[PDB]
Paper text:
Man3GlcNAc-thiazoline is an oxazoline mimic in which the anomeric oxygen at the reducing end was replaced with a sulfur atom. The Man3GlcNAc-thiazoline could be regarded as a transition state mimic and was resistant to Endo-A hydrolysis. The overall structures of the Endo-A in complex with Man3GlcNAc-thiazoline and Endo-A in complex with GlcNAc-Asn are identical to that of the free protein. While the thiazoline part of the carbohydrate moiety is buried deep inside a hydrophobic pocket formed by W93, F125, Y131, F169, Y205, F240, F243 and Y299, the mannose rings reside on the surface. As expected, the nitrogen atom of the thiazoline is hydrogen bonded to the side chain oxygen atom of N171. N171 probably orients the acetamido group for a nucleophilic attack and also stabilizes the transition states. Analysis of the structure of the binary complex of Endo-A with Man3GlcNAc-thiazoline reveals that E173 is well positioned to carry out the protonation of the anomeric carbon. The structure of Endo-A in complex with Man3GlcNAc-thiazoline reveals that N171 may be the essential residue that facilitates the intramolecular attack on GlcNAc during substrate assisted hydrolysis to form the 1,2-oxazoline ion intermediate. In the structures of the free Endo-A and Endo-A bound to Man3GlcNAc-thiazoline, the side chain of W244 is perpendicular to W216 and introduces a steric block at the entrance of the active site.
Numbering used by the authors:
A (entry chain A): 2 to 465, 469 to 524, 529 to 588, 595 to 615
B (entry chain B): 2 to 466, 469 to 524, 528 to 552, 556 to 587, 595 to 615
The structure:
């Protein structure tokens, strides 16, 4: 039923002749959210080291084809929220039936970028048993007299146009001779020479020097020529196959090659069993020694795909990325699954003012504006996913639980729920964010919450022990309480952490929903109605995207008030069925100040 | 004489009808060096604070017109080297006779960017006494039914295409009414709404709310609408005029406006007297409490324009930016001119591996490759200016002096000279760089020097968080220069926060070092080069090509290979061709590619 723009995918011959200017969908697939530079690490877990990196190969979209460019009316969508333990994201996709070169969709590029995570697209040369064809490989490996590889040029051009950070190269098609192998090496090297600074090409350990498919599970003499060859750099990293018990040898070989052992990502296959995946952790993270290499997670989206509901999906992600403890700071290294927080510092991109979050998880059963439902429809749009709490979860005192709620929202479709038993006079704190926010005059702390039992919600901030204080100026907005705490008295200081605290009352119960937290007015959007060629009877709204803007909201007038029908963090939005009606487009600033609405007939 | 591409400059009606695709010179005026993000500050001066910023309005080129796009065969050029005390650089230019909208030339954009300094172009509405015309102002302020300002669009387009970071707006043309004033405010507001993130529009404290020209010398009720109007942002900063004795009031007013006092730049006019400029420093930097606002330096290029020689120019810049002490760490706050180091931390963009410097100052009397002269001609090309020492100069022990030398070079036209008396058995160190360089396996320290008296030159590195002085591991001789390599694998996972050198005196009692390369950290593919017409000059041509620090163009002669051109962009204009050429690409590590041959 969906006739809108779709995220792209290609077989090599379609890519060759692909031009953004001629692709009706290309403008919808561009990310307009740059990779946030300079994340800051936390230090709450004593066992976590600073050397090892982590890549995730995640099916952020279950399918390669049929993915709407910019979100969809579906609550249950893969709203991964553990960007903070991730150094590199690989968009897992590609199939013999749909296309083997697949960039990440723009919604996911955006989510990744807000958390300063570089995201790679996938070039998937499938095993013949899965419809793999040598032809496709040979096509990609075509070389001009020039020496250049035209399809490599297309990889770079796609990554440049759509706005992501490189490619994962997965060569599992059998039948390749040694000449093909050398050509692949030339192809990867050509990538290195031509790519923009920062771009990352990650090679899967599969095709060896002979062209045979022969996973090494380590960096060996059989595969090292795909990472580094003497003084020539071939690839930025290698994802090691799963069948290893120890990685010391790869570390040693990497040093002999003059490369960091941490450009090797020891692979762990978690697709089927997630946290029940058996792993020789000592083989990667030895006892008094630093990590032998980095870590590669194949398919953490297990959490999504083995679950039926958003809540079970979110619980499995916590258990997987943080561990059975539910506390990043208190991990059980003796557990079968200690969790990623056991080994990896959490990073935060809350490093710049203004810092704003509405605890938007990226989807919802409903959409709220200033605490009022403005659409009752399921939606996902991971471009609207906020930077979520560094820690999941760190509390002190009370018998409380913290989770995301999709029942209450102030902006978007979720809130942070903090609820349970808190005895009278008892104090509880929840430390949420590692940060690096320079305070200057005019800088305020605001936050917005509901409280079912009337307890007030204090804010907590840590300066370069948390300071817990109550807000200065209170305001009521559709049932929500918004505090503003001026921080002028602290100008010149730097906030390195954000938190909340509450005091129990006679009730003995606490139930908070917090829908905005921030440390820190756009022009009405200039909007044009254009054809979306592939769908007459549909249209697209196109504006000039302002850098002061977090995203755009499209309302349509109804007999029952204004209804939200669209959101975009790009420069356009496709609306179906319009040819067949008054619209209102507002731009919301980074601080979520709404502009005056442009009217469109 | 020179018929090559020239740095641009417009009156408003020329800008209106400008499009890059039709300008033969536009491609030569594009910067290909992005603004380096994330500089790191030093801590060596106890009095320096972290709040106040500093803008320089510098005539990096003496003239608006006649500026070659990419360097010129002139040694004495304004090779400003104090980017480290500068937060914002404004390219000072514009005149009634030449053009009043002028972007920075590509060479200067590049130098600025390498040091992570945002550089602004100039929009100069001149006083009528200087040929100013209200017309030009009215032209710039034209508004469509749309509400948009077409010439503002051209300012943003120029900045985008050429690769710089905004504009300084200088409105000193008399005769403007209150309507013009409001239009200017709308123009500045339109800029804010349309500009790319990061871009900076700085407004001069001149035209007040009535449109009259009435410098306030402070942020007042008469000019605040040009910075901020309620919740609307009008400009990113204001450069306050010079006639102030104190700035507390502007600080206070800025707070009431909900803006940082440090978006205000208290102006100091140093054009005529440089370090002899009288300043009420206490009025800006109160003996305790913070600085009231930021600092605005009008014309530090006094150092260049009041001097006749590179050496005198370089000495005056030291005396101006560092002080009479010659030591950023030991400043005399009681001096008439304590120097900028007295108040401002030095920043460094040595924050990423590979870090490479050849101590190229941007010009030379001569050009060297691997220590051999490959051209005897004066040159300047500030696209080749390296990130130069954070500290000028910090030494311990000996009776030594450090300066730049244009007599000895390993790559380019200059080296760092460290020379004087060092008694046998004595030690001396010179701390050169504040850095932030993650060490990983495969990472080496290299350095390259000549020593007139045979002392060896040790490298110094400080780890996060006293320097480690060690001697190199592998020695190499290259055309009279010694190159040490010191593997740093034993330190992988550590971070270098500082680089230095150290020497031990010998029986000679003398030391004379010239150091031409220092680096913490693969040869490029031969450039794919085409010969194209440079339309405005038949009998001239341009080489155009598509990792790489810069390109070198050699021509074959009866006397060997001669360097005739360098470019950090995608092309170079060569005059007189009409002859075998050789184009090599040099990597960031200065590994040369195989030369493309061109006939
Ligand atoms: C890097 C790495 N690359 C391989 C990775 O490809 C491999 O993955 C597995 O991939 C199987 C094949 O996928 C392709 O072909 C399928 C059928 O035509 C398509 O549906 C698919 O989208 C691809 O184009 C895949 O079928 C595997 O899934 C099956 O087994 C799983 C257990 O591992 C299970 O969880 C599934 O639900 C399913 O039955 C699988 O994801 C991995 C693992 O073998 O190794 C390297 S890592
Ligand atoms: C921001 C700030 N803007 C003004 C700034 O413009 C002003 O500068 C002075 O500017 C004078 C006028 O310059 C223009 O007109 C000249 C003549 O047609 C041109 O040659 C020029 O390039 C411009 O288009 C200028 O003449 C002043 O220089 C003279 O006095 C100097 C002392 O300040 C002296 O050092 C010179 O050698 C010369 O005789 C001067 O640079 C400043 C200072 O008044 O105020 C604000 S800051």
């Amino acid at each position: 039923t969906y006739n809108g723009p779709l995220s792209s995918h290609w077989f090599p011959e379609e890519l060759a002749q692909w031009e953004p200017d001629s692709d009706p969908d290309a403008p919808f697939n561009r990310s307009h959210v740059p990779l946030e530079p300079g994340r800051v690490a936390d230090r709450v877990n004593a066992n976590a080291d600073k050397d090892a990196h982590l890549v995730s190969l995640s099916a952020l979209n279950r399918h390669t084809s049929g993915v709407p460019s910019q979100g969809a009316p579906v609550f249950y969508e893969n709203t991964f929220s553990y960007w903070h333990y991730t150094d590199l994201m690989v968009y897992w996709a590609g199939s013999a039936g749909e296309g083997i070169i697949v960039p990440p969709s723009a919604d996911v590029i955006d989510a990744s970028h807000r958390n300063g995570v570089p995201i790679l697209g996938n070039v998937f040369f499938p095993p013949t048993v899965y419809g793999g064809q040598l032809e496709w490989l040979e096509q990609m490996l075509e070389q001009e007299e020039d020496g250049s590889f035209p399809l490599a040029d297309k990889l770079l051009e796609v990554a440049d146009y759509y706005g992501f950070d490189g490619w994962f190269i997965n060569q599992e098609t059998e039948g390749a001779d040694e000449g093909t192998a050398e050509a692949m090496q030339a192809f990867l090297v050509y990538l290195q020479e031509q790519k923009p600074e920062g771009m990352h090409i990650m090679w899967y350990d599969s095709m060896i020097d002979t062209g045979a498919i022969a996973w090494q599970n380590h960096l060996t003499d059989r595969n090292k020529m795909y990472l580094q060859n003497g003084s020539t750099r071939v690839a930025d990293s290698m994802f090691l196959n799963f069948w290893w018990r120890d990685q010391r040898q790869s570390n040693e070989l990497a040093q002999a090659l003059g490369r960091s052992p941490y450009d090797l990502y020891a692979g762990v296959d978690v697709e089927a069993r997630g946290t029940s995946t058996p792993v020789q952790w000592e083989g990667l993270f030895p006892e008094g020694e630093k990590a032998h290499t980095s870590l590669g997670l194949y398919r953490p989206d297990w959490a999504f795909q083995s679950s039926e509901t958003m809540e079970a999906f979110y619980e499995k992600e916590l258990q997987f990325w943080v561990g059975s403890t539910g506390n990043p700071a208190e991990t059980d290294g003796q557990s079968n699954w200690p969790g990623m927080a056991h080994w990896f510092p959490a990073k935060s991109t809350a490093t710049s003012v203004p810092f704003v979050t509405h605890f938007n998880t990226g989807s919802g059963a409903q959409f709220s504006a200033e605490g009022k439902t403005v659409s009752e429809q399921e939606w996902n749009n991971r471009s609207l996913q906020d930077v979520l709490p560094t820690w999941r979860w760190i509390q002190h005192g009370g018998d409380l639980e913290a989770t995301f709620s999709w029942e209450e929202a102030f902006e978007g479709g979720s809130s942070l729920q903090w609820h349970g038993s808190l005895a009278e006079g008892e104090h509880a704190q929840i430390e949420l964010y590692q940060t690096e926010l320079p305070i200057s005059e005019g800088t305020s702390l605001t936050w917005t919450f509901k409280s079912e039992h009337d307890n007030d919600l204090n804010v907590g901030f840590r300066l370069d022990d948390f300071r817990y204080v109550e807000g200065e100026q209170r305001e009521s907005i559709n049932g929500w309480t918004q505090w503003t705490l001026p921080l002028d008295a602290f100008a010149g200081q730097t906030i390195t952490g954000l938190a909340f605290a509450a005091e129990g009352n006679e009730t003995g119960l606490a139930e908070f929903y917090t829908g905005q937290l921030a440390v820190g007015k756009p022009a009405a959007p200039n909007v044009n109605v254009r054809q979306y060629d592939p769908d007459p009877s549909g249209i697209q709204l196109v504006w000039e995207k302002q850098s002061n803007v977090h995203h755009y909201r499209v309302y349509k007038e109804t007999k029952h008030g204004k209804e939200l029908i669209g959101t975009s963090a790009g420069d356009r939005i496709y609306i179906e069925g319009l040819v067949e009606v008054r619209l209102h487009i507002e731009a919301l600033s980074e601080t979520f100040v709404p502009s005056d609405a442009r009217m469109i007939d």
